[PDB]
């Protein structure tokens, strides 16, 4: 607990940019793209007010659009007077991916009609398309094979405070080991992380901060409409903060909270607000109506685990179940606690043999070990119960492919 | 099964993709259905065997579906999963190994079920070739059968050896196969693929 992330002061004009969303549509061959930029304003609207969106490739401008405020008709009462949408045509766009993170710079400028600037906002824009077609997750029209890992925000000395040096270290180490995707383990991450994944090329699954694993039953609060406002806040604010990042390709509703009506409501909300990304959720059997992807936790390649209400099928048998059409990506597999990752080759043989088996996220990246000091003042790695803490789960906090200081395990 | 096989045609659908042979195939299908449509033991109609995939097969499958909706129709030619079958019915597809032939791939039966867009049940029209000392890996097929719902079994090839009785100089009978009668280019002992001998004596694989 504490103030573990950065605190800052922001000064904005009275008439200001309050919100903006960037969207990229494409044609069939991806030779033509449209950048849709929706900008919202706060303060008193004036007729001289303008918004310009310019797209930049390096130092070269490739597109620009200027318009006054006032969107199209939405319903019988009109449209948003304090909003504007710009459509920038891009011919032969350079496509973002994990292999080539081609990035554009979009600058949103609030300015008067005579030309004076009031406030500028900028974001990195990647031209990519994520969709599930015929049971396969496609990126830019091609089926994806997720070489993913779950990552917690952990530091052996600073706890859960993240710095840019450690983030860059983690991303470089992941890409040097042929990882192309990262799952934000069970909460939204430090904002710089998404930017770094945009610049370096990692696919990101962004997860809402919602876990109720210790509830009996697990959906006790997530099936209660009295907790729907809290969960809805935790989902909507994450999407609103991170919806512009090209590295974010999949939304996650959370982790291990059973399956309730709140999950269905929030999945539908995400699908309505941001149709450009699929939504996944594992709780309740990993194949409910609140997931676009079958995402089992630690399902095996060939052995079924028929638990009473939430069976864990083998991933090959799961695909062929009557009525099943969705792709399967394991949200957690190949538990890396200690001397682990036996049978990894079996998972990857199945991944390359079955089309709709589109990979998974290894659990997990780094051991959540802390640094204590002995009587001689020397540091050592500590796990659960080494601080005197009330009933603990000992060494089950260390499931990483690298040590806390980011030294690789042999399983890496 | 209708009396329609064109295995030796090159390509196999040379006549079954020709509308000049549609009347003959249609007779061979319609008269079989008309004769046998009242029998309760008959649960599945088959369009034939190893004749490629042509428009004649599609036409006759649709005819059977119109005339007798109470039985599904299956057909293996053309890749065992075309529009002329209600059931994926591969010949000798394996449990775990894919056999990617250029135009008619033979997937493993577990991989076949999960192919994008695939919803049909899989019953092997021919599997576990019983030629001589055979049926190794039968337990693997039946493990997969009991583990995967849409894997609904198959038909072993086959029941009885098609061996004939010849007599030696001493007048004693012996089992003969292809080429023992002087017959023009033959396929030797490939006629004996049965679980029982010609006199219906069981093989050890039974
Ligand atoms: Na695959
Ligand atoms: Na079955």
Contact A92, A62 (CB under 8 A): no
- At B29, list the tokens: 């299908």
Give the closest-approach CA distance of B100 to chain A in angstroms.
Answer: 12
Contact list, B110 vs chain A (CB under 8 Å)? 316-317, 320
DSSP codes, A80-112: -TTEEEEEEEEESPPBB-SSSB-EEEEEEEEEE
Contact list, B115 vs chain A (CB under 8 Å)? 355
A355 alpha carbon, closest ligand = 1
Chain-centre distance for alpha carbon A395: 28
Task: Please report, in angstroms and rounded to a whole number, the separation of the first and last CA atoms in chain B.
Answer: 24
Contact list, B147 vs chain A (CB under 8 Å)? 304, 317
Chain A nearest-CA residue for B114 = A320
B87 — phi, psi (to 5°)? -135, 135
Residue A134, chain B, CB below 8 Å: the answer is yes
State the Cα–Cα distance between residues A350 and B90, nearest whole angstrom. Answer: 22
Residue B29, Ramachandran bin (φ over 0: left; ψ between -120 and 50: alpha; else beta): alpha
State the Cα–Cα distance between residues B82 and B97, nearest whole angstrom. Answer: 21
- At B71, list the tokens: 């039985």
State the Cα–Cα distance between residues A103 and A122, nearest whole angstrom. Answer: 13
Contact A41, A16 (CB under 8 A): yes
State the Cα–Cα distance between residues A369 and A407, nearest whole angstrom. Answer: 13
State the Cα–Cα distance between residues B18 and B9, nearest whole angstrom. Answer: 12
Residue B147, chain A, CB below 8 Å: the answer is yes
* Range list of H helices, A184-227: 191-200
Residues in chain B: 206
Does A134 show up as a binding residue in the annotation? no
Per-position b or e across A119-155, b if 16+ CB within 10 A of its CB: eebebbbbbbbbeeeebbbbbeeebbbbbbbbbbbbb
Here the contacts of A351-356 (C-beta below 8 Å, separation 24 or greater) are A351/A145, A352/A145, A353/B98, A353/B111, A354/A315, A354/A316, A354/A319, A354/B111, A354/B114, A355/A136, A355/A143, A355/B114, A355/B115, A355/B116, A356/A135, A356/A136, A356/A319, A356/A326, A356/A327, A356/A328, A356/B114, A356/B116
- At B202, list the tokens: 């069981």
Q: How distant, in Å, are the alpha carbons of A24, A240, A301 from that of A40?
A: 18, 13, 48
Sequence-distant (6+) residues with CB within 8 A of A26 are: A32, A33, A34, A93, A127, A129
* Range list of H helices, A215-339: 228-242, 261-273, 315-319
What is the experimental method? cryo-EM
- At A219, list the tokens: 């959906």
B124 alpha carbon, closest ligand = 2
Q: How distant, in Å, are the alpha carbons of A21, B167, B199 from that of B172?
A: 92, 5, 15
3-state secondary structure of A355: coil
State the Cα–Cα distance between residues A230 and A221, nearest whole angstrom. Answer: 10
A145 alpha carbon, closest ligand = 1
- At A97, list the tokens: 């991916």
State the Cα–Cα distance between residues A61 and A302, nearest whole angstrom. Answer: 53
Q: Which of A317, A323, A355 sits opposite B148 (nearest CB)?
A: A317
Q: How many CB pairs under 8 A join A and B?
A: 34
3-state secondary structure of B14: coil
Contact A376, A363 (CB under 8 A): no
- Return the closest-CA partner of residue A46 out of A110, A109, A119, A107: A110
Contact A198, A124 (CB under 8 A): yes
State the Cα–Cα distance between residues B147 and B139, nearest whole angstrom. Answer: 12
According to DSSP, the β-strands at A103-112 and A16-26 are unpaired
Chain-centre distance for alpha carbon A109: 27
Quote the crossing angle between the two packed helices B22-36 and B55-67, to the nearest 10°.
30
Contact A87, A36 (CB under 8 A): yes
Chain A nearest-CA residue for B121 = A322
3-state secondary structure of B155: strand
Chain-centre distance for alpha carbon A312: 25
Chain B nearest-CA residue for A354 = B111
Residue A353, chain B, CB below 8 Å: the answer is yes
State the Cα–Cα distance between residues A102 and A95, nearest whole angstrom. Answer: 6
State the Cα–Cα distance between residues A176 and B92, nearest whole angstrom. Answer: 43
**CA of residue A39 to ligand 2 center, whole Å:** 55
Q: Enter the DSSP assignment of A326.
A: S
Q: Which residues of B are catalytic?
A: 50, 126
- Return the closest-CA partner of residue A160 out of A404, A348, A410: A404
- Return the closest-CA partner of residue B63 out of B105, B87, B101, B33: B33
State the Cα–Cα distance between residues A276 and A130, nearest whole angstrom. Answer: 6
Residue A116, chain B, CB below 8 Å: the answer is no
Q: Which residues pair with A147 in a beta bridge?
A: A360
3-state secondary structure of B66: helix
3-state secondary structure of A200: helix
This PDB structure is determined at a resolution in Å of: 2.4
State the Cα–Cα distance between residues A295 and A324, nearest whole angstrom. Answer: 13
Contact A63, A122 (CB under 8 A): no
Other CB atoms within a 10 A radius of the CB of residue A331 amount to 28
Contact A348, A376 (CB under 8 A): no
Catalytic residue among A119, A256, A303, A375: A256
Other CB atoms within a 10 A radius of the CB of residue A391 amount to 6
* Residue A256 appears among annotated catalytic residues: yes
- At A245, list the tokens: 């990042």
Contact B44, B56 (CB under 8 A): no
B117 with A136: Cβ contact below 8 A: no
- At A313, list the tokens: 């099928």
**CA of residue A359 to ligand 1 center, whole Å:** 7
* Range list of H helices, A134-260: 164-175, 191-200, 228-242
Other CB atoms within a 10 A radius of the CB of residue A274 amount to 17
**What distance separates the 2 farthest-apart alpha carbons in chain A?**
76
Q: Is the dihedral of CA A313, A315, A317, A319 positive or negative?
A: positive
State the Cα–Cα distance between residues B97 and B109, nearest whole angstrom. Answer: 9
Chain A nearest-CA residue for B148 = A317
State the Cα–Cα distance between residues B111 and A324, nearest whole angstrom. Answer: 14
Q: How distant, in Å, are the alpha carbons of A68, A145, A250, A295 from that of B12?
A: 68, 37, 47, 43
- Return the closest-CA partner of residue A126 out of A276, A244, A270: A244
Here the contacts of A178-182 (C-beta below 8 Å, separation 24 or greater) are A178/A147, A179/A147, A179/A148, A179/A149, A180/A98, A180/A99, A180/A146, A180/A147, A180/A148, A181/A98, A181/A146, A181/A147, A181/A148, A181/A149, A181/A205, A181/A359, A181/A361, A182/A148, A182/A149, A182/A150, A182/A151, A182/A361, A182/A365
State the Cα–Cα distance between residues B176 and B189, nearest whole angstrom. Answer: 9
Q: Which of B111, B117, B147 sits opposite A353 (nearest CB)?
A: B111
Give the closest-approach CA distance of B139 to chain A in angstroms.
Answer: 16
Contact A235, A208 (CB under 8 A): yes
Binding residue numbers of B: 5, 7, 50, 126-129, 186, 190, 193
* Residue A324 appears among annotated catalytic residues: no
Residue A71, chain B, CB below 8 Å: the answer is no
Contact B125, B154 (CB under 8 A): yes
Does A281 show up as a binding residue in the annotation? no
């Amino acid at each position: 607990s504490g103030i573990f992330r950065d605190v800052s002061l922001l000064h904005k004009p009275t008439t200001q940019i309050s919100d903006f969303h960037v969207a990229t549509r494409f044609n069939d061959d991806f030779s033509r793209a449209v950048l849709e930029a929706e900008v919202q304003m706060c303060g008193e609207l004036r007729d001289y007010l303008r918004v310009t969106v310019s797209l930049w490739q390096g130092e070269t401008q490739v597109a620009s659009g200027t318009a006054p405020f006032g969107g199209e008709i939405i319903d019988e009462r009109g449209g948003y007077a304090d909003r504007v949408t710009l459509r920038l045509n891009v011919e032969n766009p350079k496509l973002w991916s994990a292999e080539i993170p081609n990035l554009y710079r979009a600058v949103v400028e609030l300015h008067t009609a005579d030309g004076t600037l009031i406030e500028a906002e900028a974001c990195d824009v990647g031209f990519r398309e994520v969709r599930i077609e015929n049971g396969l997750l496609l990126l830019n029209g091609k089926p994806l094979l997720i070489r993913g890992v779950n990552r917690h925000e952990h530091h052996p000395l600073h706890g859960q405070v993240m710095d840019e040096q450690t983030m860059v270290q983690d991303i470089l180490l992941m890409k040097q080991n042929n990882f192309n995707a990262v799952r934000c383990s069970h909460y939204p991450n430090h904002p710089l992380w998404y930017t770094l994944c945009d610049r370096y090329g990692l696919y990101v699954v962004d997860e809402a901060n919602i876990e109720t694993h210790g509830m009996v039953p697990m959906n006790r609060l997530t099936d209660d409409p009295r907790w729907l406002p809290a969960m809805s806040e935790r989902v909507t604010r994450m999407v609103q903060r991170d919806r512009n990042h090209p590295s974010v390709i999949i939304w996650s509703l959370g982790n291990e909270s059973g399956h309730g009506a709140n999950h269905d409501a929030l999945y539908r909300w995400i699908k309505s607000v941001d149709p450009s990304r699929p939504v996944q959720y594992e709780g309740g059997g990993a194949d409910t109506t609140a997931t676009d992807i079958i995402c089992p936790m630690y399902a095996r390649v060939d052995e079924d685990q028929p638990f009473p209400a939430v069976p864990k099928w083998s991933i090959k048998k799961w695909l062929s179940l009557p009525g099943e059409t969705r792709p399967l990506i394991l949200c957690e597999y190949a538990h890396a606690m200690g001397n682990s990752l036996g049978g990894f080759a079996k998972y990857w043989q199945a991944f390359r043999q079955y089309p709709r088996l589109q990979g998974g996220f290894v659990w997990d990246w780094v051991d959540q070990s802390l640094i204590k000091y002995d009587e001689n003042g020397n540091p050592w790695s500590a796990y659960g119960g080494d601080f005197g803490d009330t009933p603990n789960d000992r060494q089950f906090c260390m499931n990483g492919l690298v040590f806390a200081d980011r030294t690789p395990h042999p399983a890496l």
